[PDB]
Ligand SMILES: COc1ccc2nc(C)c(O[C@@H]3C[C@H]4C(=O)N[C@]5(C(=O)NS(=O)(=O)C6(C)CC6)C[C@H]5/C=C\CCCCC[C@H](NC(=O)[C@@H](NC(C)=O)C(C)(C)C)C(=O)N4C3)nc2c1
């Protein structure tokens with residue numbers, strides 16, 4: 001009945017992939033209990049840093065990547081959810097189910113990647129475990145792993161970046177292409193689609 005209808009919680013930043021130095025590594029900034037509470041209130045006063053965030057809802061965890069002042073992620077992770085922020089929940093400024101893409105204004109303190117203009121096909125995928133995986137671009141939205149891995153290795157990394165050798169953003173990781181459970185290729189949202197969506 002109408003009186004009892006519930007509200008879905010916000011997406012919550014729970015950590016980041018640290019790429020600032022010589023070694024990439026995941027950092028957690030909020031535990032599961034505090035995540036649950038923050039999703040309900042939508043109020044997150046934690047300091048945000050970096051380009052690649054680890055994000056969670058009550059039921060899923062994945063990544064989000066700042067490019068040109070927008071924190072981007074996948075619709076299959078975030079749906080239409082707000083993101084928690086210091087002043088309460090923030091509505092998406094981009095939503096495109098056809099591209100599996102959503103975006104919010106980038107949090108204060110985040111740093112943004114620059115869209116790639118290199119035209120290079122030697123890419124790097126950053127996972128939620130801070131693995132930096134070489135990927136050869138094979139089309140507008142496809143790349144092959146130089147070393148295939150079980151899909152388990154990639155699960156939870158949608159919303160993460162594919163980068164060029166210079167560290168520019170080339171795309172947002174969307175889906176794995178698997179045969180017999182092995183990811184030989186990845187599907188990604190090209191940065192040009194983001195730049196157009198914008
Ligand atoms: C609800 O509205 C929408 C709108 C658009 C949309 N567009 C889509 C393309 C879409 O894809 C679905 C989600 C996406 C996915 O799991 N992504 C992540 C990830 O990590 N997620 S996650 O864990 O962070 C999560 C779950 C918390 C968020 C990167 C992969 C990591 C590991 C792979 C695990 C096995 C799944 C293999 C799927 N791959 C295939 O189905 C391909 N087929 C074969 C045979 O290979 C292809 C892609 C069909 C060729 C696949 O990757 N999937 C299915 N869903 C949607 C929904």
Ligand SMILES: [Zn+2]
Nearest residue numbers: 116118164168
């Ligand atoms: Zn580049």
